[PDB]
Amino acid sequence: GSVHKHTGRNCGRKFKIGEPLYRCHECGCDDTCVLCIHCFNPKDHVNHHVCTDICTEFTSGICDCGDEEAWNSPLHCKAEEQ
Numbered sequence: 001g002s003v004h005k006h007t008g009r010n011c012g013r014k015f016k017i018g019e020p021l022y023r024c025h026e027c028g029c030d031d032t033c034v035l036c037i038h039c040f041n042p043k044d045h046v047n048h049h050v051c052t053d054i055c056t057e058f059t060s061g062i063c064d065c066g067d068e069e070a071w072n073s074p075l076h077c078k079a080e081e082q
């Protein structure tokens with residue numbers, strides 16, 4: 001794959017139509033806190049209740065990876081992996 005790292009800042013990627021918005025019950029500050037496909041690291045959420053929404057005209061947003069106020073636990077952004 002090829003994916004942009006956002007080291008030292010938040011992701012903030014606007015979701016594209018058809019894309020999943022990842023939600024983690026355990027990690028998210030609340031249920032508006034979401035991760036994009038570049039960022040969501042399944043290893044962070046092995047023991048967690050995770051769900052996806054799909055981006056449409058009415059369900060939109062931006063990825064919260066790297067916004068420390070959105071997350072209870074440290075995230076390991078998938079983009080950072082080698």
Ligand SMILES: [Zn+2]
Pocket residue numbers: 011012013035036037038039040063064065
């Ligand atoms: Zn992201």
Ligand SMILES: [Zn+2]
Pocket residue numbers: 006011038039040065066077078079
């Ligand atoms: Zn990220």
Ligand SMILES: [Zn+2]
Pocket residue numbers: 024025026027028044045048
């Ligand atoms: Zn989690």
